[PDB]
Enzyme design. Sequence first.
Site, PDB file in Angstrom:
ATOM      1  N   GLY B  37       8.826  19.577  93.759  1.00  0.00           N
ATOM      2  CA  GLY B  37       8.732  19.765  95.205  1.00  0.00           C
ATOM      3  C   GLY B  37      10.070  19.650  95.894  1.00  0.00           C
ATOM      4  O   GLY B  37      11.036  19.113  95.329  1.00  0.00           O
ATOM      5  N   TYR B 109       4.565   9.444  87.642  1.00  0.00           N
ATOM      6  CA  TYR B 109       4.312  10.896  87.697  1.00  0.00           C
ATOM      7  C   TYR B 109       2.777  11.086  87.774  1.00  0.00           C
ATOM      8  O   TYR B 109       2.042  10.519  86.952  1.00  0.00           O
ATOM      9  CB  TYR B 109       4.903  11.594  86.455  1.00  0.00           C
ATOM     10  CG  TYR B 109       4.500  13.051  86.310  1.00  0.00           C
ATOM     11  CD1 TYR B 109       4.642  13.945  87.371  1.00  0.00           C
ATOM     12  CD2 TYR B 109       3.992  13.542  85.103  1.00  0.00           C
ATOM     13  CE1 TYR B 109       4.262  15.285  87.248  1.00  0.00           C
ATOM     14  CE2 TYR B 109       3.619  14.885  84.966  1.00  0.00           C
ATOM     15  CZ  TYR B 109       3.780  15.756  86.037  1.00  0.00           C
ATOM     16  OH  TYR B 109       3.422  17.084  85.956  1.00  0.00           O
ATOM     17  N   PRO B 111       0.096  13.751  87.414  1.00  0.00           N
ATOM     18  CA  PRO B 111       0.067  15.111  86.843  1.00  0.00           C
ATOM     19  C   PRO B 111      -0.930  16.120  87.385  1.00  0.00           C
ATOM     20  O   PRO B 111      -0.772  17.317  87.118  1.00  0.00           O
ATOM     21  CB  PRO B 111      -0.145  14.852  85.334  1.00  0.00           C
ATOM     22  CG  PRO B 111      -0.897  13.574  85.297  1.00  0.00           C
ATOM     23  CD  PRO B 111      -0.383  12.742  86.441  1.00  0.00           C
ATOM     24  N   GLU B 114      -0.901  18.417  93.781  1.00  0.00           N
ATOM     25  CA  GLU B 114      -1.234  18.071  95.159  1.00  0.00           C
ATOM     26  C   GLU B 114      -2.648  18.479  95.500  1.00  0.00           C
ATOM     27  O   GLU B 114      -3.110  19.566  95.112  1.00  0.00           O
ATOM     28  CB  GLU B 114      -0.284  18.744  96.158  1.00  0.00           C
ATOM     29  CG  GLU B 114       1.180  18.392  95.953  1.00  0.00           C
ATOM     30  CD  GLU B 114       2.129  19.286  96.723  1.00  0.00           C
ATOM     31  OE1 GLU B 114       1.657  20.228  97.400  1.00  0.00           O
ATOM     32  OE2 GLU B 114       3.351  19.032  96.660  1.00  0.00           O
ATOM     33  N   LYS B 155      -1.397  14.111 104.988  1.00  0.00           N
ATOM     34  CA  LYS B 155      -1.652  15.550 104.820  1.00  0.00           C
ATOM     35  C   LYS B 155      -1.900  15.851 103.349  1.00  0.00           C
ATOM     36  O   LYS B 155      -1.405  15.109 102.479  1.00  0.00           O
ATOM     37  CB  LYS B 155      -0.514  16.434 105.370  1.00  0.00           C
ATOM     38  CG  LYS B 155       0.843  16.166 104.760  1.00  0.00           C
ATOM     39  CD  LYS B 155       1.892  17.092 105.391  1.00  0.00           C
ATOM     40  CE  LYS B 155       3.247  16.705 104.895  1.00  0.00           C
ATOM     41  NZ  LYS B 155       4.298  17.448 105.621  1.00  0.00           N
ATOM     42  N   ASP B 171       5.085   9.844  99.456  1.00  0.00           N
ATOM     43  CA  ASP B 171       5.842  10.149 100.665  1.00  0.00           C
ATOM     44  C   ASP B 171       5.687   9.136 101.774  1.00  0.00           C
ATOM     45  O   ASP B 171       4.858   9.297 102.683  1.00  0.00           O
ATOM     46  CB  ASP B 171       5.528  11.547 101.192  1.00  0.00           C
ATOM     47  CG  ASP B 171       6.137  12.642 100.368  1.00  0.00           C
ATOM     48  OD1 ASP B 171       5.845  12.697  99.144  1.00  0.00           O
ATOM     49  OD2 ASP B 171       6.911  13.438 100.930  1.00  0.00           O
TER      50      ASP B 171
HETATM   51  C1  LIG Z   1      11.461  15.240  99.938  1.00  0.00           C
HETATM   52  C2  LIG Z   1      11.491  16.020  98.800  1.00  0.00           C
HETATM   53  C3  LIG Z   1      10.312  16.541  98.276  1.00  0.00           C
HETATM   54  C4  LIG Z   1       9.088  16.287  98.887  1.00  0.00           C
HETATM   55  C5  LIG Z   1       7.807  16.860  98.303  1.00  0.00           C
HETATM   56  C6  LIG Z   1       7.030  17.788  99.251  1.00  0.00           C
HETATM   57  C7  LIG Z   1       5.747  18.276  98.603  1.00  0.00           C
HETATM   58  N1  LIG Z   1       4.893  17.165  98.148  1.00  0.00           N
HETATM   59  C8  LIG Z   1       5.559  16.251  97.138  1.00  0.00           C
HETATM   60  C9  LIG Z   1       4.699  14.978  97.033  1.00  0.00           C
HETATM   61  C10 LIG Z   1       5.100  14.155  95.819  1.00  0.00           C
HETATM   62  N2  LIG Z   1       5.037  14.852  94.526  1.00  0.00           N
HETATM   63  C11 LIG Z   1       4.850  14.146  93.299  1.00  0.00           C
HETATM   64  N3  LIG Z   1       4.388  14.912  92.284  1.00  0.00           N
HETATM   65  C12 LIG Z   1       4.051  14.213  91.191  1.00  0.00           C
HETATM   66  N4  LIG Z   1       4.113  12.891  90.993  1.00  0.00           N
HETATM   67  C13 LIG Z   1       4.620  12.201  92.037  1.00  0.00           C
HETATM   68  N5  LIG Z   1       4.855  10.856  92.113  1.00  0.00           N
HETATM   69  C14 LIG Z   1       5.415  10.634  93.326  1.00  0.00           C
HETATM   70  N6  LIG Z   1       5.558  11.723  94.058  1.00  0.00           N
HETATM   71  C15 LIG Z   1       5.046  12.728  93.252  1.00  0.00           C
HETATM   72  C16 LIG Z   1       4.924  16.317  94.630  1.00  0.00           C
HETATM   73  C17 LIG Z   1       5.752  16.910  95.761  1.00  0.00           C
HETATM   74  C18 LIG Z   1       6.902  15.756  97.742  1.00  0.00           C
HETATM   75  C19 LIG Z   1       9.074  15.497 100.032  1.00  0.00           C
HETATM   76  C20 LIG Z   1      10.254  14.977 100.553  1.00  0.00           C
END
Ligand SMILES: c1ccc([C@@H]2CCNC3(CCN(c4ncnc5[nH]cnc45)CC3)C2)cc1
Lengths: 20, 337
Positions: B37, B109, B111, B114, B155, B171
């Site tokens: 992301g 992580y 897996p 979202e 969200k 987040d």
């Molecule tokens: C700054 C950079 C990236 C993001 C993204 C935006 C989209 N959603 C996200 C939410 C966390 N994200 C994770 N994926 C897998 N395991 C995780 N453990 C902690 N966060 C994640 C997927 C992307 C963060 C937010 C702020």
Amino acid sequence: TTYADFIASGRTGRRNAIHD
Amino acid sequence: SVKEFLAKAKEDFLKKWENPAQNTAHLDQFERIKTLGTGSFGRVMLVKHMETGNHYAMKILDKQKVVKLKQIEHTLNEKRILQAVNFPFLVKLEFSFKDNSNLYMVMEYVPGGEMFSHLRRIGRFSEPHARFYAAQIVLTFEYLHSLDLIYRDLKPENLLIDQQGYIQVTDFGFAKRVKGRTWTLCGTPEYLAPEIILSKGYNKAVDWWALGVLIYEMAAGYPPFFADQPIQIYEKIVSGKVRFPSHFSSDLKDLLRNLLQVDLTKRFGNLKNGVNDIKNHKWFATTDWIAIYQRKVEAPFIPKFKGPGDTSNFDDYEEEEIRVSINEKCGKEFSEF
Ligand SMILES: c1ccc([C@@H]2CCNC3(CCN(c4ncnc5[nH]cnc45)CC3)C2)cc1
């Protein structure tokens, strides 16, 4: 339909937060 | 007992809040695999910790971009809060550190991808599916609010589905520990409570309004207030009007009228009975709150898992190099990180 209006809108992708 | 559980949770939180963990790993201890992301000042990458072979999600924030976007205090809030919390539906922060160029937060992580991805693809969730997820958010906010924390960015993009089908809230970029009122205009347009748009002081009640938006979006497949531009969204939010799909149950509509309530003296979660007005609502009659917390409830959806390090549940993003300058950037600003 409201669904069709949503799908045709520019805000169906990931939405960013507001920043200052 | 809820009161007793929350009192002990606060004792645990405060010890970490007052003495935050700092500099617990180094970038060289991780193998970078793929971008999960992106944000305006950073990205989240799948990484492998060499010493254990464990996979983690590493958030990388560019210090100079954080400064330009005036997010210094919000970033310090994010890391200080995330390292101090402990709840079944909150993602765990394993390590944090910084170098000349960036800030790093290494988290569990998740897996399954979202909730956003699954919701957009399937279209909408059934009321029992939406209710299962909503119960986890209710308990998570009860926990956060008891610690005087306001979340401010609920969200589907921020809610990850784990291997067991349960939610992991990620987040904490706009989370803040505040006892009185606060004034920052932040969050995502579709999820903003009217008091934020109208530049009033606001409190934890904004998170309960955001829960109403989330439940509506999960059950309808679209948010209650949408348009092509944020300004049109704000006009709809402040209007005092919501339309429900004809398939929404009578109980769901009643719950949503009480959460998507402009009047703070009437909004659920903000009354004398607090969270209990939500937990005891007719729409949640089938919910066993303890079984949800203990993760004993069968999930309505189990994400596909090809194995460790698989990212099939995530979209593909453009890959960029992690550059570390030979000179320290913004040292004073991020001294406490
Ligand atoms: C700054 C950079 C990236 C993001 C993204 C935006 C989209 N959603 C996200 C939410 C966390 N994200 C994770 N994926 C897998 N395991 C995780 N453990 C902690 N966060 C994640 C997927 C992307 C963060 C937010 C702020």
